[PDB]
Design an enzyme around this catalytic site. Structure first.
Site, PDB file in Angstrom:
ATOM      1  CG  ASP A  46      -2.069   0.964   1.232  1.00  0.00           C
ATOM      2  OD1 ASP A  46      -2.359   1.589   0.211  1.00  0.00           O
ATOM      3  OD2 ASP A  46      -2.689   1.173   2.281  1.00  0.00           O
TER       4      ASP A  46
HETATM    5 ZN   LIG Z   1      -3.914   2.723  -0.065  1.00  0.00          ZN
END
Ligand SMILES: [Zn+2]
Length: 280
Positions: A46
């Site tokens: 992420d």
């Molecule tokens: Zn993210």
């Protein structure tokens, strides 16, 4: 800061070293790590967050003593309490960090972090966003030995993550923070300066109503071309045409979130050099 604007909208002597990157359900980049010598477990790569946060199942694991406690939100969809530990993270082939801060969820709503990550099947979030000027919170990559800590090249279509200084020329480089100013063009409209977050966990992405000239609360119509250039408007970072199954959700306000698209298209380097920028 970036974490305030980070949303995953659901549509439904070594200098370098590479490890497999698994794409799950087209959009989710997953890598495997071992925490304190434990079993290899999937985590979601992420770029939109900074910090390694593990599902509450990891409370059964031996990460040593709790060194800290807190509450936080993830990706605008999960509120959680967590314990912080100091433990090692291994990406395999003895690519091992110094002990470093890892958070484990102690409770969350709605549901657990594993449930929230059900699109990837990951059981933790490997937030690898740069985070300049916030010395408290750094990607776990910064705790790798020697030049391995400089950055990571993410190459979703090749199925690889490569630690260390970038070995490719040009391409997109993320530095400073996961949000930077770029220029955005919808169809053949004007190039507009806009903050954008290059978020590898952002699925099919979001775009604000004002930037898109569309009402908020639905998806961008299929057949819409979106092009993202450096801030000076001189170099194309990426472009694509939306489809019925690959289209951003239109938000009221906030910032554009690329979702997976630029990552699927190109290798993208995340640099941890002191310095939010994106260059091509
Ligand atoms: Zn993210």
């Amino acid at each position: 800061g970036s974490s305030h604007h980070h949303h995953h909208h659901s549509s439904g002597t070594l200098t370098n070293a590479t490890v497999p990157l698994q794409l799950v359900n087209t959009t989710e980049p997953v890598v495997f790590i071992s925490l304190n010598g434990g079993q290899m477990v999937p985590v979601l790569l992420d770029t939109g967050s900074t910090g390694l946060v593990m599902d509450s199942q990891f409370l059964t694991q031996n990460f040593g003593p709790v060194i800290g406690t807190g509450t936080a939100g993830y990706a605008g969809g999960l509120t959680y309490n967590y314990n912080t530990y100091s433990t090692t993270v291994d990406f395999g082939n003895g690519l091992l960090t110094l002990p470093t801060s890892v958070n484990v969820v102690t409770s969350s709503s709605p549901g657990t972090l594993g449930n929230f990550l059900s699109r990837s099947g990951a059981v933790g979030v490997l937030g690898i966003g740069p985070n300049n000027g916030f010395p408290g919170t750094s990607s776990i990559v910064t705790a790798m030995p020697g030049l391995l800590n400089n950055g990571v090249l993410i190459d979703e279509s090749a199925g690889i993550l490569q630690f260390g200084p970038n070995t490719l020329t040009g391409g997109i480089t993320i530095s400073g923070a996961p949000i930077s100013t770029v220029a955005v063009q919808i169809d053949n409209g004007p190039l507009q300066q806009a903050p954008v977050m290059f978020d590898s966990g952002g699925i099919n992405g979001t775009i604000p109503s004002a930037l898109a000239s569309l009402p908020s609360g639905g998806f961008v119509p299929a057949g819409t071309t979106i092009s993202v250039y450096t801030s000076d408007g001189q170099t194309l970072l990426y472009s694509y045409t939306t489809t019925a199954t690959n289209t951003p959700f239109v938000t009221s306000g906030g910032v554009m979130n690329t979702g997976h698209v630029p990552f699927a298209q190109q290798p993208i380097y995340v640099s941890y050099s002191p310095t939010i920028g994106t260059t091509t």
